[PDB]
């Protein structure tokens, strides 16, 4: 309506509504995307996203494994703070401290959880009085805790009673992993102190991942007697010290067979375990501000949701006319064509980034399906003999 | 502009469904591998 | 032969002095990075510079790209090749099959 | 009280084995059950107005 | 002698997140090649249309 300047926008507006907040959101989104994605954590040079030739290499590489670095996953927390940490009950130690990546922790659990026979004598009859290394039965009992009784009693509940399963139901529930957008690592509760138990929401999700990935039942490594016999058979120099060659080679083949099957199983399981930990770590808190007394805590999923829905509805935004920072739709309703055009440009950039994330998930799906199909085909190997 | 915001939100929903797909596939692959634990029997 | 070359020298049963046990962290320290799935899909540009040297016992990786490639080799069951027919049985069957009949 | 440690540890291992298998099965099944209930709850009625 | 090493995934990431944040972009006002959002904040309608 071009008749008077009174109803014209005074002062005119040509810029975006607020470039500061949106730019902050984009920067946090970049930081979350580079931090949340799990990174193989064994050496500084192994976690690098890019080499030294990429411009901005230091910033990109520094954001590797941020979620667990902030969570102090390597440090064996006692659970009083309820942080995401390697629990000593089910994670193998590094001395006959813990590994910096949960997926490499799972791989190490699969590879080096020794059999219970290593805590028993040579003939497998008695138990040694002192045995400080965790065997499969030991870690598995540590998961279970004190064995619940059969019939319910006043002192202790039955294995099927609701009182006994009060924390277990939450621990094994799948929604503990995918429902929340930002895990709460504060220990606001304390479950029953009988073996493996979670102390907070994030610990509940981590325990659910532990249960669903079958990390509470490690594979059975070879017995002490049998492995010792096979190794002495297969390592001694042939035709010397009372040994031969054909039998030694057969023993070596058998031992390498077990080891290669174990390694293949470890890698194939690690694919899914890293998948689960990618799902979880999308929702773990991450530090952004250089200030360590008043930081900025947000996660990939929380920031991602805020990015998706900072224009449909925003609880922070004012809901009464006359106040600033109204809803995005209301601001659009009274905005200049240049401003809404720039908003459209920003929205298209958002769409592009979201499509990139969706394709990353699709790539994850492809890896999962290919690994499982290859496992099926390995189980379906052709037979050579003709009978 | 509002249509583009809608498109962004729908893509977010599609992403969430894809993540659910990924969780399902990963859990089922873990079950398949747990059914195929490498045995230590040497005899 | 290939499968031994993968396994290198067979680790001992229970010791962590001169040589590490098959379940000790010292023995597994280079293996876990190879077997970890994140060694393939986490980085965006592999490093092809030998910044480390694993234990010289069979198949080992010298850099991040080697770690990812070895992970693919392990997860694709290329370290346990299929069993081809025995020499004697295959020779007998081929002799029985390629010979012109009635002669 | 008429017990040893080898048999006790073996029995404890067996009981913990059953319990761990049951917990793993429950946790793995909960993924699919929660997915089904997500599909259902996508279509379930929810009130919106602050008043009732 | 003028090699420029890049990968499909790295370039894909750079394409996806060049306009969100850029570590090579100046973060101080008054400097060239600054962040994409700030450049949009001052661009002409034709320029933002071409960027769209």
TrEMBL record, chain B:
<protein>
    <submittedName>
        <fullName>IcmX (IcmY)</fullName>
    </submittedName>
</protein>
Automatic annotation (TrEMBL), chain D:
<protein>
    <submittedName>
        <fullName>IcmX (IcmY)</fullName>
    </submittedName>
</protein>
